[PDB]
Each structure stands twice: as C-alpha cells, then as structure tokens.
Homo-oligomer: A and B are copies of this chain.
Amino acid sequence: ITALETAIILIAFVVVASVFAFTILSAGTFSTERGKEAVYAGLSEVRSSIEIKGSVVIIGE
C-alpha cells in the first residue's frame, strides 16, 4: 500500500521543482541582459563631450 502511495506524491514534488527551476533560468537571463546594458550606456555618455575652438564673433546688423 505504502509503495503505490509514495510514487504519486514523489512525481508531484519533482514537477513542481521542474517548473520552478525553469522560471529561475528564464528570470536570471533577463537580469543579466539588463545589467549589461547599463555599463555600455554609462560609458557612452562619459566620452561624448564637445569643445569650443577659436573665438566668438558677432555680426552687426
């Protein structure tokens, strides 16, 4: 009796872990991708400066 019972509960717990494990794998991939974007975005901003060369001239109407 106890043998037939234990099989059914055993399958139930394995499936739950499988679904949970799949969710973590997909969730973890999203987090890594988002973290990578930030570093590239930050580096681009710092190097994008601009500079004035020469002298300023005004033209009289």
Q: Could you say which interface size class chain A belongs to?
A: 35 or more
Copies of this subunit = 2
Q: How far is the CA of A35 from the CA of B32 in the complex (A)?
A: 17
A10 / chain B contacts, CB cutoff of 8 Å? 1, 4
Q: How far is the CA of A25 from the CA of B54 in the complex (A)?
A: 44
Q: Is the interface of A mostly helix, strand, loop or mixed?
A: helix
> With A39-B31, A43-B31 as given contacts, are A18 and B25 in contact (CB-CB < 8 Å)?
no
Contact indicator B16/A12 (Cβ below 8 Å): no
A34 / chain B contacts, CB cutoff of 8 Å? 43, 47
Interface, chain A (partner B; CB < 8 A)? 1, 4-6, 8-21, 23-25, 27-36, 38-40, 43, 47
